[PDB]
Amino acid sequence: PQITLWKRPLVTIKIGGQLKEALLDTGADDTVIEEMSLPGRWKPKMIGGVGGFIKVRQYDQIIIEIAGHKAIGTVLVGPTPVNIIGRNLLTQIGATLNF
Amino acid sequence: PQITLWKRPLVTIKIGGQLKEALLDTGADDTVIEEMSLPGRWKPKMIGGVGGFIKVRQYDQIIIEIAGHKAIGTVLVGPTPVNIIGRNLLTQIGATLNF
Numbered sequence: 001p002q003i004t005l006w007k008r009p010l011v012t013i014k015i016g017g018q019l020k021e022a023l024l025d026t027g028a029d030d031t032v033i034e035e036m037s038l039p040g041r042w043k044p045k046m047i048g049g050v051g052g053f054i055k056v057r058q059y060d061q062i063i064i065e066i067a068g069h070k071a072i073g074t075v076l077v078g079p080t081p082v083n084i085i086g087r088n089l090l091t092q093i094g095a096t097l098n099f
Numbered sequence: 100p101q102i103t104l105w106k107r108p109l110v111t112i113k114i115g116g117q118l119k120e121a122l123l124d125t126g127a128d129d130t131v132i133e134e135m136s137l138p139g140r141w142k143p144k145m146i147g148g149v150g151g152f153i154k155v156r157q158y159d160q161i162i163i164e165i166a167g168h169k170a171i172g173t174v175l176v177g178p179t180p181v182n183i184i185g186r187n188l189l190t191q192i193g194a195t196l197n198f
């Protein structure tokens with residue numbers, strides 16, 4: 001679709017078989033989802049944004065559906081304030097900014 | 100224009116008579132610019148990022164040019180790691196996310 005920005009660009013995702021709401025975030029390098037049980041091995045990671053750094057679980061090669069579009073890639077899991085779809089997966093689904 | 104997301108979507112902005120580089124950020128509600136001595140009045144604000152909150156100065160009705168497109172709105176100034184153009188100004192320049 002084409003998504004305007006008057007409201008947060010929230011979409012439904014499917015991850016681990018579960019539906020969640022997430023924010024399409026062009027300012028995020030990576031994808032980070034709130035704490036959940038997720039099938040795969042993981043390793044510790046830290047990511048930083050405004051306000052500082054958080055500790056996350058890094059899961060590689062995770063199947064995720066974003067507004068009906070398939071991606072398979074790195075998903076971080078940890079105490080993010082909101083679920084965030086970042087550029088690593090926005091690129092997979094062919095998302096661009098236009099003006 | 101169209102901007103892909105293989106790298107951070109950085110553009111040139113003009114604010115306060117100065118050129119800066121800034122990130123077009125659909126995940127950001129607000130626009131946050133690195134410390135700069137903008138004139139006049141401002142209001143204290145705290146804004147929340149992925150890692151917690153930071154202190155900023157809120158300036159209203161600020162003239163800013165984003166990739167050649169003029170606009171006007173609220174700009175938050177403080178110790179941000181990157182200059183961030185958020186939805187309050189992305190809407191003004193008619194930006195969308197497309198896939």
Ligand SMILES: CC(C)(C)NC(=O)[C@@H]1CN(Cc2cccnc2)CCN1C[C@@H](O)C[C@@H](Cc1ccccc1)C(=O)N[C@H]1c2ccccc2C[C@H]1O
Binds near residue numbers: 025026029047131148
């Ligand atoms: C107005 C303000 C700027 C404070 N907003 C944000 O920071 C929001 C906060 N919400 C949360 C919120 C908090 C409170 C209230 N409402 C919402 C989550 C989404 N972010 C938007 C992010 O796109 C901001 C960027 C900024 C940044 C870019 C590059 C380098 C440093 C900082 C961000 O945090 N990106 C980082 C990022 C993000 C996810 C995964 C990995 C990484 C690395 C890095 O790219």
